[PDB]
Design a protein around this nucleic acid. Structure first.
Ligand SMILES: [K+]
Ligand SMILES: [K+]
Ligand SMILES: [K+]
Ligand SMILES: [K+]
Ligand SMILES: [K+]
Ligand SMILES: [K+]
Ligand SMILES: [K+]
Ligand SMILES: [K+]
Ligand SMILES: [K+]
Ligand SMILES: [K+]
Ligand SMILES: [K+]
Ligand SMILES: [Mg+2]
Ligand SMILES: [Mg+2]
Length: 1333
RNA sequence: GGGAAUCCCUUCUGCAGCACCGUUUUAGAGCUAGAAAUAGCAAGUUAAAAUAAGGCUAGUCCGUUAUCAACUUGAAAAAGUG
DNA sequence: CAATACCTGGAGCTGCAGAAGGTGTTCC
DNA sequence: CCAGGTATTG
């Protein structure tokens, strides 16, 4: 018996179907196991496995790193306390103990309830003197008096526990950075360069303007308005804009051809400045550096809003400013409300539920919610103008601990910490001996290239130690081998050379690697002149001359430079034709010119002796990122260069790696030639063999050595190999499930392998990314559209508005503005038409006033539109508002537009699968099926793995009226699998020559016509003009029949119409978090869970809502009443995720601890989520939890109703005669509507049992019977949510909402029939649970 | 058909370092008229500690991804069964 | 029990490797 | 978003 297998691989389902010779689906009697009447069951060999989505490891990683951070914060605190131990025991022998038990209730506290001093009077005195911690911090910074050791500890520990970010390298001293000074010095430098054009900065208050709480552009405009004759886009304007953090374009300031856009935040800036400084000279360096100093001052002024000359604690002083203004404004607001609207007073200052001040301080109201609640109250009253000004500045009634404190660097907390240490080391000797130790506690942070400081028990770790001892923040450099750890950080992640697997890959920017790339591109170039008979390769001498004259003197080498600076200058050619390179050479000696600028010794760079040295240096710049480690490694080459060059070398850094090893580039040699690969690239007679030819030439030893160097390590398992595939973890879950399904099907047929296996793989917060892209593009563009049109991230989920902002509010085809309020009138057009490229992303879509303005609809936007709009498109591209692909597609008309080959290739793409993950699935199935080799030792392909795209079966469904409606049931996955099998087998049977295209293993108009008409052999009348085809379609050579249009369509229809389809929902143990993360307040409830072993939730609160890993069926007895009489029970106990390890270690003890006695151990049944139970009248339920259920039946709606619903709802057209055809059918069969309702009702009454909902639904349907047929069908589609398999959900018929009727009791399944299903569902074990207990 | 190096993007997986909130219990003596419920007023901004229970391997480590119908032997691994 | 309504931790910043989609070149 | 936990109300 012969058969084939059709598969449909998706992120949540795997459809499967078995077909025979005649495209029929078999049906077998399968044995049924268990304790019920039934011993076997008839199963059709078609179905679909369903499962929850597989998740990325991202959430787990975030939680893990934050666990580590919490541990390390606690450890910092413990380090500090260890330092304070002895002298604090002298001062207060229970201070740290009161601190440790601060969370406990007075009942459980073993010491006095007041933490700091242990008596109420001293505590209240402290709090009256220091209402906030910043008061004590500033006092300890400024005062000369000896202080209480407890308060010293409190200030230092508050600084260490919340130490601030590390986004700034080097030190920081707030007294040196002052806006009023750096502005003046910038003016000094500017006026020194431009003596003829000086700026009068007198009377200009730089402090208030630049440090104002205003947007960057507004402060720029203010400062500009203070200086007459100087515009905002002038030199000084752009200097101030660079200082303020904008993206000014210095091109127009210096008449540059290169656009000098400079943003201080961008990582590229260090080069972006140097490059600019290479064009305008180094006299302007001092200027562009003074501007950066001013930027530093402004950024600090954002945080420190107080004069730094009255205190050495400007941060704490600004916090005290917050507190004092809060107090003053609160007093004023209370008085104002009392005078004008006292009745509101309570609601504002006593109701925590309301977003007033009461909900602000005591409730859950945020600063933003409180501002929103109180703004109308301030506008309504009189005297609130200053309070309103503070509100619009986000500076009213501010707390001290807020969201925006992330700006504070750690250097500032350190600046106050060191001050307090300097103050109090005069009175405490252990503070003098341990000053640097505490500073190090604050400042030391484990480097990212070191990772967890493990000792052989962390799979995430890689750190190697210099000595086996406990690592601390003070002995890190001596215990941790930072070099080996930073090296292993990278080497554990980089690829080896595939050709020489034992050799490490060269750095991407290695000098040898760039030499290789340049010579490899250069060897294949060819040139012709007049006297030449034939194009000729470049000799080794010509290549060396081109490298020395062009590649070693120009950053890039254009074709024009090749024609003029060489062929004309050297070869005396006035005209030459070049091939093998277009416009410019892709390769370039970038590292060569980098090191030429840094070291300024070209003879050193050209000398072959220094090669090694240079290589090492570049690698040291690529392998590392810490400038101290870079300096240490380059110290060996300290003698070679000056200290200036050495500093400039430290600064430059490289990221990225190549793909080939040095032992391959310039390592292995040919036995007879004695030449390396790079030697052959430099010169190879008149063959000019490049890399590929060199390593594939049998006349050379390279290929021999390549294979000889190949090792093969240990083989991966199926799961290991699937995990290591590049793809989404969800689709990998689907792939593994697919392979398991195929294994079980092969076992079903009787270990007979199928003829073919047809596979189809489906296609494939965000609003935050959209807002980030638009902000970056608009601020890089310099446009003010966000000022004039504010928008939230959610709003960008509208396609037209997102396109509007990506296009800066302009038509993309016409150089004109677009209106927001008229987006409904505009058009969204595909750049390359969707008839050729089925692409609906933003990358191929464009917002325009009218698509007519694109030109002809049959091609790429016309040449006229490109000439009009290329500059605007390039602006959008540099602003990253449009991608490279969008820009290249938009401008393709200037490059000939769409050729006929392009259209043929697009049609071919629509039908042939080129995705790599699909090829990997095909390879897995192929290697699992075909295992034997023939006489020539070549693979014997018994099973052909065909891969198809979705459009094939989609158009097949639309062309022969085998419609799908996804909401009706889950049968459409299995039907997709069956249709895949049918179409694929028939397609390769009709055209065997397509095997190379469609089977795994080893004129443009002609192919366009061919691939566009590949699927016409199913049709009877082609209408492409109206050709006809035979009723029987056979193979041309074999004469074998592939399709009988009279009989086979009926076969497919019968197969689709069959009601019994093996839908199996994958039963899965729940994993992840223990419960809801929210820490609830204390409450009299046994649903609360302790956050620590001794924290009784009735006193301290805790968690509730724990996630059940899996339920367990318990047959035992429980004590009843005060008498504790044993009463037999049979019930479901949900083992929570947190209870799982304890329950599995010893289930009997766990269950007895829960109250169960005499537990029948052998009747304990493990029931994961979605466990299937069947009841009366075939009614099924799925275990949603231990006390909640899900719908477990499928509504097998007949095929006539499904097709009617598709056609009537305008689901997705064709000829207008065929449109009237479909329509007249819909209108003739309107009586189906009622029938469909009936079919639903009889279903819901039999299986769903949602009486109230069903009656509401019937009323809703009878209410809208006068609605158009299309709309009634569209809402009948929604109706199927009531009958859909799985969890109940709310749906909506028109404007009536039907709330889900959840199943909140699981008692009935305790006497129903449990169903254990194999992966296909063909094999069942059914257990009658009524026979238990 | 498959594959490779290279220019230019773009997206997606994996990992490590760090902050800022939030929340929870406690500490910041509420006062006065009431027997009392309650009324009138005062006040509020800060901190400690925990942030998966916890584990042994005791590290400044690990603890939320992947994998899982049933049954037989198996300690597990696995293999086998219609 | 069953209807019903509400609830869910936010999601900054730095550094790194890799495969893979899209154009284009030179090749096995 | 989803959908399972929770209290409330009855
Ligand atoms: K990431
Ligand atoms: K006590
Ligand atoms: K001006
Ligand atoms: K609050
Ligand atoms: K090029
Ligand atoms: K680097
Ligand atoms: K899991
Ligand atoms: K899950
Ligand atoms: K490529
Ligand atoms: K209190
Ligand atoms: K299963
Ligand atoms: Mg912990
Ligand atoms: Mg806090």
């Amino acid at each position: 018996k012969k058969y084939s297998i059709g598969l449909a691989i998706g992120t949540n389902s795997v459809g499967w179907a078995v077909i025979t010779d005649e495209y029929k689906v078999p049906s077998k009697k399968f044995k049924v196991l268990g304790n019920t009447d039934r011993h076997s069951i008839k199963k059709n060999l078609i179905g679909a496995l369903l499962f929850d989505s597989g998740e990325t490891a991202e959430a787990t990683r975030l939680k893990r790193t934050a666990r580590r951070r919490y541990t390390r914060r606690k450890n910092r605190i413990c380090y500090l306390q260890e330092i304070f131990s002895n002298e604090m025991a002298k001062v207060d022998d229970s201070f740290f103990h009161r601190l440790e038990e601060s969370f406990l209730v007075e009942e459980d506290k073993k010491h006095e309830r007041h933490p700091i001093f242990g008596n109420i009077v001293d505590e209240v005195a402290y709090h009256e003197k220091y209402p906030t911690i910043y008061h004590l911090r500033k006092k300890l910074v400024d005062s000369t008096d000896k202080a209480d050791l407890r308060l010293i500890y409190l200030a230092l520990a508050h600084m260490i526990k919340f130490r601030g970010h590390f986004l700034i390298e080097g030190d920081l001293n707030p007294d040196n950075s002052d806006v009023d000074k750096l502005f003046i010095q910038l003016v000094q430098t500017y006026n020194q360069l431009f003596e003829e054009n000086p700026i009068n900065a007198s009377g200009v208050d730089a402090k208030a303007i630049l440090s104002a709480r205003l947007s960057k552009s507004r402060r720029l405009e203010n400062l500009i308005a203070q200086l007459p004759g100087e515009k905002k886009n002038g030199l000084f304007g752009n200097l101030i804009a660079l200082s303020l953090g904008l993206t000014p374009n210095f091109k127009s300031n210096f008449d540059l051809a290169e656009d000098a856009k400079l943003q201080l935040s961008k990582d590229t800036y260090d080069d972006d400045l140097d490059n600019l400084l290479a064009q305008i000279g180094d006299q302007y360096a001092d200027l562009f550096l003074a501007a950066k100093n001013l930027s530093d001052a402004i950024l600090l002024s954002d945080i420190l809003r107080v004069n730094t000359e009255i205190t050495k604690a400007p941060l704490s002083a600004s916090m005290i400013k917050r507190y004092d203004e809060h107090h003053q404004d609160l007093t004023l607001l209370k008085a104002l409300v009392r005078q004008q609207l006292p009745e509101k007073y309570k609601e504002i200052f006593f109701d925590q539920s309301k977003n007033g001040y009461a909900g602000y301080i005591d409730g859950g109201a945020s600063q933003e919610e409180f501002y929103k609640f109180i703004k109308p109250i301030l506008e309504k009253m009189d005297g609130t103008e200053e309070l309103l000004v503070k509100l619009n500045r986000e500076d009213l009634l501010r707390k001290q601990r807020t969201f925006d404190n992330g700006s504070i660097p750690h250097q500032i907390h350190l600046g106050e910490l060191h001050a307090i240490l300097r103050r109090q080391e005069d009175f405490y000797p252990f503070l003098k001996d341990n000053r640097e130790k505490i500073e190090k506690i604050l400042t030391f942070r484990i480097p990212y290239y070191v990772g967890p400081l493990a000792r052989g028990n962390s799979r995430f770790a890689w750190m190697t130690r210099k000595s086996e001892e406990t690592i601390t923040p003070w002995n890190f450099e001596e215990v941790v081998d930072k070099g080996a750890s930073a090296q292993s950080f990278i080497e554990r992640m980089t690829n080896f050379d595939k050709n020489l697997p034992n050799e490490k890959v060269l750095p991407k920017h290695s000098l040898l690697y760039e030499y290789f790339t340049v010579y490899n591109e250069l060897t294949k170039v060819k040139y012709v002149t007049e006297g030449m008979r034939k194009p000729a390769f470049l000799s080794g001498e010509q290549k060396k001359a081109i490298v020395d004259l062009l590649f070693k003197t120009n950053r890039k080498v254009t074709v024009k430079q090749l024609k003029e600076d060489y062929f004309k200058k050297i070869e005396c050619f006035d005209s030459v034709e070049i091939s093998g390179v277009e416009d410019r050479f892709n390769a370039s000696l970038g590292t060569y010119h980098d090191l030429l600028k840094i070291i300024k010794d070209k003879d050193f760079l050209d000398n072959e002796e220094n090669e090694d040295i240079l290589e090492d240096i570049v690698l040291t710049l690529t392998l590392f990122e810490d400038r101290e480690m870079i300096e240490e490694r380059l110290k060996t080459y300290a003698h070679l260069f000056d200290d200036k060059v050495m500093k400039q070398l430290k600064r430059r850094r490289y990221t990225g790696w190549g793909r080939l090893s040095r032992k391959l580039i310039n390592g292995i040699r040919d036995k007879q030639s004695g030449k390396t690969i790079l030697d052959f690239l430099k010169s190879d007679g008149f063959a000019n063999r490049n890399f590929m030819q060199l390593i594939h030439d049998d006349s050379l030893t390279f290929k021999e050595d390549i294979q000889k160097a190949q090792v093969s390590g240990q083989g991966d398992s199926l799961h290991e190999h699937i995990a290591n595939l590049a793809g989404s973890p969800a689709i990998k879950k689907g792939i593994l499930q697919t392979v398991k399904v195929v294994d079980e099907l092969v076992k079903v047929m009787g270990r007979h392998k199928p003829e073919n296996i047809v596979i189809e793989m489906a296609r494939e917060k965000n609003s935050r990314e959209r807002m980030k892209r638009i902000e970056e593009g608009i601020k890089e563009l310099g446009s003010q559209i966000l000022k004039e049109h504010p928008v939230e991230n959610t709003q960008l989920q509208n396609e037209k508005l997102y396109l509007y902002y990506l296009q800066n509010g302009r038509d993309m085809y016409v150089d004109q503005e677009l209106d927001i309020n008229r987006l409904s009138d505009y058009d969204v057009d595909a750049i390359v038409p969707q008839s050729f490229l089925k692409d609906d992303s933003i990358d191929n879509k464009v917002l325009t006033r009218s698509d007519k303005n694109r030109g002809k609809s049959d091609n790429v936007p016309s040449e006229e539109v490109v000439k009009k709009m290329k500059n605007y498109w390039r602006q959008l591209l540099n602003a990253k508002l449009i991608t490279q692909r969008k820009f290249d597609n938009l401008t393709k008309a200037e490059r000939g537009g769409l050729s006929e080959l392009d259209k043929a290739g697009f049609i071919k793409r629509q039908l042939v699968e080129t995705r790599q993950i699909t090829k990997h699935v095909a390879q897995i199935l192929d290697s699992r099926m075909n295992t034997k080799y023939d006489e020539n030792d070549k693979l014997i392909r018994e099973v052909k793995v065909i891969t198809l795209k979705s459009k094939l079966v989609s158009d097949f469904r639309k062309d022969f009226q085998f419609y799908k409606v996804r909401e009706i049931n889950n049968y459409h996955h299995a039907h997709d699998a069956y249709l895949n099998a049918v179409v694929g087998t028939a397609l390769i049977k009709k055209y065997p020559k397509l095997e190379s295209e469609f089977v795994y293993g080893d004129k443009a108009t002609a192919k366009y016509f061919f691939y566009s008409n590949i699927m016409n052999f199913f049709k009877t009348e082609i209408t492409l003009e109206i050709r006809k085809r035979p009723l029987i379609e056979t193979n041309g050579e074999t004469g074998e029949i592939v399709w009988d249009k009279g009989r086979d369509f009926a076969t497919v229809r019968k197969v689709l119409s069959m009601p019994q389809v093996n839908i199996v929902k994958k039963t899965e143990v729940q994993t992840g978090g223990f419960s809801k993360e929210s820490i609830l307040p204390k409450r009299n409830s046994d649903k609360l869970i302790a956050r620590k072993k001794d924290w009784d939730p009735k006193k301290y609160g805790g968690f509730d809502s724990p996630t059940v890993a899996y339920s367990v069926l318990v047959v035992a007895k429980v004590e009843k009443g005060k008498s504790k009489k044993l009463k037999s029970v049979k019930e479901l106990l949900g083992i929570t995720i947190m209870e799982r390890s304890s329950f599995e270690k010893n289930p009997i003890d766990f269950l007895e601890a829960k109250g169960y006695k005499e537990v029948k151990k052998d009747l304990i049944i493990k029931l994961p989520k979605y466990s299937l139970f069947e009841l009366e009248n075939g009614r099924k339920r799925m275990l949603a939890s231990a006390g909640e259920l899900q719908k477990g039946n499928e509504l097998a709606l007949p095929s006539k109703y499904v097709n009617f619903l598709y056609l009537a709802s305008h689901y997705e057209k064709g000829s207008p005669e065929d449109n009237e055809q479909k329509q007249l059918f819909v209108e003739q069969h309107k009586h189906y509507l009622d029938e469909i309702i009936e079919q639903i009702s009889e279903f819901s009454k039999r299986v769903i049992l949602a009486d109230a909902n069903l009656d509401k639904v019937l009323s809703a349907y009878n209410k809208h019977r006068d609605k158009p047929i299309r709309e009634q069908a569209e809402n009948i589609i929604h109706l199927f949510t009531l009958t859909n398999l799985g969890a109940p959900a709310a749906f909506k018929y028109f404007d009536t909402t039907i709330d889900r009727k959840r199943y909140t009791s699981t008692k009935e399944v305790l006497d129903a029939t449990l169903i254990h299903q194999s992966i296909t569902g063909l094999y069942e074990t059914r257990i009658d649970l009524s026979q238990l207990g």
